[PDB]
Design a protein around this ligand. Structure first.
Ligand SMILES: Cc1cc2cc([N+](=O)[O-])ccc2[nH]1
Ligand SMILES: Cc1ccnc(N)c1[N+](=O)[O-]
Ligand SMILES: [Cl-]
Lengths: 267, 1051
């Protein structure tokens, strides 16, 4: 029992079993010249490690020693909070999540064909992580390409300003040179000034049409940008559960037959 | 039969090198057409489209335009051309006046091909060389001027303090101290010589060579001394002159009197590169020398006239720029009598599949690195659609208990279907110490690759700048007055009180989690447990028992300074009572070694008082050498500062402006990360400071920057439009392009960014080529333009790589380099080759070429016999023998065996990508080194992984044969006993320094390297070093781990 004990396992791999569980989840760990066992309680995405000392029979945190076993001390705190021993620990040992992962995995006692599933799920996972990765590149390329368009538009608008000014700039200096003299040159002079001005505005006209045509592509880009995020967030939740099953399968195997080295062909 | 005739209906056959894109030379296009039409806008209002050569100078274009305008009307309304300057809109959207009329039309970064003519407004032309600055930076300085936020503008004004102080240290004892800035002495940290380096001398003597020039130039003269290793440049300068000016016409007395007049007119250069020996330091301390000893070379220094050196430096001439707490007695934080509550309001832009996702909510939490209270969310309201919660969230911490460095971390999520959409954090106090109150608009960031966690507090403080992303706005409680953080003056009193208070409690009480009987005596068993803790690495997380234990003993902990990191993580940052006291301990805690004090600048120590202490540690101990080694970690660790303006930023900025070797790399690492918006502004602001105050080096940097842009463009064309062309055709394109005059200009006269000691002269094009990789790296070659090219290297070559992302390599090579030092300076000679690497951009960089080295594969191609059948295990050895013959051979194996030993241990400890024939390299001299490291801490273990503790360097026969001269059954020689004994001694040597290696990796979490997303990424290094064990177990662990990859050898 005290070897089984559900939550008893007996540092890094603790934190990976504790990763992404809720406020209250726990388990127990084993230098012996340090202490004996170690309760690892999770509180708000952070791991609280509590020392278990063993001497004349008693197992305890410090003073309140009268609990004759390791399993004596934990059941007591599954019902109750940890604040009475040490102040800022008003959270219980709520979730003793250390099921040996026979809860699902198709209850398969096949050993071999559980390992086939582990390949299957790990191929789906590894496929899925590429799709997630692929899309993250698209996202970040698109974020960039968008802002380059946004900058380009300002540049366009600034270019336009210099040209809108230029068609106006000549009106002043040209229509001084129409009224003074007038007979001198006349249609000869003013035509070839009128030509220059007619170039200038149709150019502006092109430029503005060039900017518009960018902007329409910006919305289409910005639209696709949304569609990427949209589908990133569809893929994200499957990816965690497909991952979570592939931890529990791989755990269920490494309970009975150790076979740590046999795994790598499937995976 | 193969597939069970199962069709994949979806599949359709119709439908390397990835980090794009950018545009280069004109808005649309990478490479402007060789001949081009450009609209010249005149003051008179005429447009005159001018056909111009791509490469034409603006002087040429102006000159021709004022010829060609004559033929248009209104020519009488133009002035002389000399009363005009070109202006146009650049790709950065700013109207840049084009002052330097020597610049070429392709080099302008025009948006559209057009040019406006004007008489130069802004009569301080000089002042509008912030163009220089903004070119170096890659964003225009005017883009800052228009930033609303007053922190930014306060950074800019107040950081100038630092600049002006640095410029003063330069022009203090000039010209010497200026020369000292530009050409700092490149020396080791210790003058002590390791026993293996010494024993390569005649009881401490080296043969040297001092070269000299007399008339006109072009003849040089050797003066081959044999001075003491530990004699100094001045002494060596004398002996060179003595022997130079001995004669049959000069008495001995007469000689000394010619030596004294001559001696101080000279200083020692290194022949072949711009290093110089400018201060009292044992010759052996200068890095050049100590290499020449290790490599079996005779140092080649040059006697150079101080006045020809002081010819070459011009003045830095620092200019203060154009850009040159008022309420009342505001309310103290500790007067506010309420818990924190935070009004969430509405996210706007949440992109979710409503079919897929049920319901979405905002998660929140207060944090300090780790969290001051229960995390809380809000209700699952407005499940998707237009998500809107007008809640107040209520946090069980009294407003006075909020620590100065406190930060709110939030994240919109989806629903045990729990899943983060976006995130963003906010500093609860602003940069002026002011508790944040009112309405806030926070644009969110997307969840990165590895982060499955709901909330992400280690990520950067502040909004996202990308507008079109989930903006979740919110509101903070308003206490009728601007609330501020209490003074130190105030905090010191409240601590002194909490101390006096603590003395008069009952002992009855002192039996609950603090203080106790001990009093001023303590216990010896207690004092034993404390140093035992202290010695543990940072990642051996501490228990609540040990925290309370350490916290009670906080005053004894002053005896053991090095415990501080452990102690600080014991403080309850929510009990301001505790924190105020810790502020007083830290106030005058003993300073500690920089390798230890760097831990205190990671994410887990965000307090100002702590981080100040840490800067004080550095200010005291950390040398210009050791700063320059750890500089990446220090530039990175700026991401974890709360505000723009802070002590660490002021430390580094000053070092950068004081020592131009640091400055050089300090620029490039900042500039490197410029694309990344988590730091775009911070680092830009900072780079503006540096650039404004660094003296002439700006102009030098501006050439390096101009050169890299040319190269980025070139490769970007080669990778997008000259893919699906032959190497043949591509090369025709590369050489053609390189020969254009704008490239010739822009790629020939500059300093290597890999090391600005080396100059890059004319570029030998015949030896320039695109390597065979799909990423299309360029292999570039320059003529070393030194006076003594010949004595060091006649040609200089470095590889430019447009794909890839060097910064993982960058770090592992940096790690290697530190292990080499740790080893060698502790007397044991393992020769690692941390070949140089430098990222300058978004997957862009430079890699040092090592001449005369070959991938094992090449060895075996060049040793493979006749009809392709099987390669020989001996070819390596046979190829190596062919090079090294005689007594030379024996040392070539020793080298192989020494370098192989180190590369075995480093590789195993770092878990770098599996080693195999095409990424392991051996030299003519027989030294081994690894290239192309891939992913470091076993980052292919995200796919399965789990306690794999892999061996990446697996010594095949090939290696073993060479190690044991030539024996069959190699695993059995004493040659190999030694090798193993190297490996074990080295493995243990790194194990004693594992605190550092953790901390170095810890500091790098800041960067967006997928290999380093959070501390358990780093935790692989604990298993592989075996830190939770005794060293004897760790040895056996290593032997075990080593044994099973080779299947026999190790006991
Ligand atoms: C890219 C980079 C190369 C390098 C070389 C040394 N060094 O060995 O002197 C110090 C710091 C450095 N950073
Ligand atoms: C080291 C570690 C592991 C898990 N959660 C944490 N908060 C943590 N830490 O306190 O840096
Ligand atoms: Cl190389």
């Amino acid at each position: 029992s005290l070897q089984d004990a559900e939550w008893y396992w007996g540092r890094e791999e603790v934190n990976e079993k504790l990763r992404d569980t809720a406020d209250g989840t726990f388990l127990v760990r084993d230098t012996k010249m340090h202490g004996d066992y170690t309760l690892t309680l999770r509180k708000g995405g952070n791991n609280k490690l509590i020392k278990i000392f063993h001497r004349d029979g008693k197992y305890g945190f410090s003073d309140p020693l009268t609990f004759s076993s390791v399993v004596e001390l934990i059941n007591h705190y599954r019902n109750e909070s940890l604040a009475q021993y040490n102040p800022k620990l008003d959270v219980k040992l709520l979730y003793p999540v250390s099921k040996y992962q026979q809860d699902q995995v198709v209850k398969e006692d096949n050993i071999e064909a559980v390992g086939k599933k582990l390949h299957e799920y790990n191929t789906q996972f590894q496929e899925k992580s590429r799709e997630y990765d692929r899309l993250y590149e698209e996202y970040t390329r698109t974020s960039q390409e968008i802002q380059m368009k946004r900058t380009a538009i300002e540049a366009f608008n600034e270019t336009i300003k210099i040209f809108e000014e230029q068609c106006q700039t000549q009106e002043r200096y040209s229509k001084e040179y129409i009224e003074k003299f007038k007979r001198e040159g006349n249609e000869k002079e003013i035509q070839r000034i009128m030509h220059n001005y007619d170039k200038l505005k149709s150019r502006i006209s092109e430029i503005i049409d060039s900017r518009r045509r960018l902007e329409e592509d910006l919305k289409k880009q910005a639209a696709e940008y949304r569609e990427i995020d949209k589908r990133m967030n569809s893929i994200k939740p499957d990816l965690i559960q497909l991952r979570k099953t592939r931890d529990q399968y791989l755990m269920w195997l490494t309970q009975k037959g150790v076979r740590q080295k046999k795994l790598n062909e499937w995976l | 039969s193969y597939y069970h005739h199962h069709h994949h209906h979806d599949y359709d056959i119709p439908t390397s090198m990835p980090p794009r894109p950018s545009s280069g030379e004109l808005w649309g296009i990478h490479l402007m057409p060789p001949r081009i039409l450009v609209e010249c806008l005149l003051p008179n209002g005429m447009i005159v489209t001018l056909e111009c050569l791509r490469e034409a100078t603006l002087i040429t274009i102006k000159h021709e335009l004022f010829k060609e305008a004559r033929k248009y009307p209104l020519h009488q309304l133009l002035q002389d051309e000399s009363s005009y300057i070109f202006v146009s809109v650049t790709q950065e959207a700013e109207r840049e006046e084009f002052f330097d009329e020597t610049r070429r039309l392709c080099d302008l970064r025009l948006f559209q091909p057009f040019l406006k003519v004007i008489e130069p407004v802004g009569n301080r032309e000089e002042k509008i060389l912030n163009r220089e600055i903004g070119f170096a930076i890659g964003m225009p300085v005017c883009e800052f001027d228009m930033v609303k936020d007053p922190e930014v503008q306060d950074f800019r004004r107040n950081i100038l303090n630092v600049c002006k102080e640095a410029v003063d240290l330069r022009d203090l004892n000039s010209p010497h101290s200026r020369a000292m800035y530009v050409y700092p002495p490149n020396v080791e940290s210790s003058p002590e010589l390791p026993k293996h380096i010494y024993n390569k001398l005649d009881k401490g003597q080296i043969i040297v060579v001092i070269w000299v020039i007399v008339s006109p130039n072009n003849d040089k003269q050797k003066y081959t001394l044999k001075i003491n290793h530990d004699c100094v440049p001045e002494q060596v300068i004398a002996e060179a002159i003595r022997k130079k000016t001995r004669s049959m016409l000069l008495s001995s007395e007469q000689l000394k009197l010619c030596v004294l007049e001559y001696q101080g007119k000279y200083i020692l250069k290194v022949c072949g590169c711009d290093e110089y020996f400018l201060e009292k330091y044992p010759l052996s301390q200068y890095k050049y020398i100590r290499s020449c000893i290790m490599l079996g070379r005779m140092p080649n220094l040059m006697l150079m006239a101080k006045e020809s050196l002081y010819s070459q430096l011009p003045m830095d001439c620092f200019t203060m720029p154009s850009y040159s707490n008022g309420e009342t007695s505001t309310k103290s934080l500790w007067v506010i009598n309420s818990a924190l509550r935070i009004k969430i309001l509405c996210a706007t832009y949440v992109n979710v599949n409503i079919r897929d996702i049920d319901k979405i909510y905002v998660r929140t939490g207060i944090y300090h690195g780790g969290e001051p209270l229960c995390d809380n969310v809000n209700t699952q309201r407005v499940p998707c659609s237009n998500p809107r919660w007008n809640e107040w969230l209520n946090y069980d911490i009294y407003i006075p208990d909020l620590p100065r460095a406190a930060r709110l971390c939030l994240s919109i999520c989806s629903v045990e279907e729990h899943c983060p959409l976006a995130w963003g954090n906010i500093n609860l106090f602003d940069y002026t110490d002011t508790l944040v109150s009112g309405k806030m608009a926070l644009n969110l960031w997307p969840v990165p690759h590895g982060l499955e966690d709901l909330l992400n507090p280690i990520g950067v403080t502040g909004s996202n700048p990308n507008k079109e992303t989930p903006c979740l706005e919110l509101e903070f409680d308003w206490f009728s007055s601007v609330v501020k953080f209490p003074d130190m003056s105030v905090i010191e009193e409240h601590a002194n009180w909490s101390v006096s208070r603590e003395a008069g409690f009952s002992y009855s009480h002192a039996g609950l989690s603090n203080r106790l009987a001990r009093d001023n005596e303590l216990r010896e068993n207690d004092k034993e447990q404390l140093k035992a803790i202290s010695t543990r690495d940072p990642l051996s997380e501490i228990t609540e028992q040990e925290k309370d234990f350490l916290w009670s003993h906080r005053h004894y902990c002053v005896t053991i300074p090095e415990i501080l990191p452990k102690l600080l993580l014991s403080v309850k940052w929510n009990s301001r009572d505790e924190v105020a006291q810790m502020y007083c301990l830290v106030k005058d805690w003993p300073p500690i070694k920089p390798e230890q004090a760097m831990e205190l600048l990671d994410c887990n120590y965000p307090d100002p008082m702590v981080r100040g202490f840490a800067v004080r540690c550095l200010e005291k101990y950390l040398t210009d050498d050791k700063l320059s080694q750890y500089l990446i970690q220090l530039v990175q660790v700026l991401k974890y500062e709360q505000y723009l303006d802070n002590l660490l930023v002021r430390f580094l900025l000053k070092k950068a402006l004081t020592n131009q070797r640091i400055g050089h790399f300090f620029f490039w690492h900042l500039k490197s990360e410029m694309h990344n918006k988590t730091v775009s502004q911070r680092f830009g602001l900072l780079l503006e400071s540096y650039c404004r105050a660094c003296g002439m080096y700006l102009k030098h940097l501006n050439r390096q920057v101009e050169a890299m842009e040319k190269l980025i463009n070139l490769t970007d064309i080669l990778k997008q439009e000259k893919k699906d062309e032959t190497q043949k055709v591509q090369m025709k394109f590369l050489v053609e392009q390189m020969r254009r005059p704008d490239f010739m200009d822009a790629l020939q006269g500059f300093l290597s960014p890999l090391n600005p000691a080396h100059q890059l002269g004319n570029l030998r094009l015949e030896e320039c080529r695109i390597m065979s990789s799909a990423k299309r790296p360029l292999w570039l070659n320059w003529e070393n333009p030194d006076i003594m090219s010949e004595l060091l290297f006649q040609n200089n070559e470095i590889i430019f790589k447009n794909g890839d992302d060097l910064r993982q390599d960058m770090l592992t090579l940096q790690i290697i380099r530190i292990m080499e030092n740790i080893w060698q300076n502790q007397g044991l000679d393992l020769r690692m080759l941390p070949y140089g690497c430098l990222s300058i951009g978004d997957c862009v960089g430079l890699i040092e070429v090592v001449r005369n080295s070959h991938t094992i594969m090449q060895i075996q191609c060049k040793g493979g016999l006749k009809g392709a059948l099987q390669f020989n295990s001996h070819t390596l050895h046979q190829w190596l023998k062919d090079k090294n013959k005689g007594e030379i051979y024996d040392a070539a194996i020793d080298l192989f065996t020494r370098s192989c030993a180190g590369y075995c241990v480093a590789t195993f400890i770092l878990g770098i990508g599996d080693r195999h024939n095409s990424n392991i390299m051996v030299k003519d001299d027989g030294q081994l080194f690894h290239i192309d490291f891939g992913h470091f801490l076993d980052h292919k273990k995200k796919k399965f992984g789990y306690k794999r503790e892999r061996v990446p360097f697996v010594l095949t026969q090939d290696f073993l044969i060479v190690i044991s001269k030539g024996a069959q059954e190699c695993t059995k020689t004493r040659e190999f006993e030694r090798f193993q004994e190297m490996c074990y001694k080295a493995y243990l040597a790194i194990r004693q320094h594992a605190n550092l290696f953790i901390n170095l990796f810890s500091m790098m979490l800041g960067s967006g390297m997928p290999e380093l997303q959070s501390f358990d990424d780093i935790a692989y290094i604990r298993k592989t070093l075996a830190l939770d064990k005794t060293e004897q177990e760790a040895l056996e662990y290593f032997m075990k781990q080593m044994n099973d990859a080779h299947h026999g050898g190790w006991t």
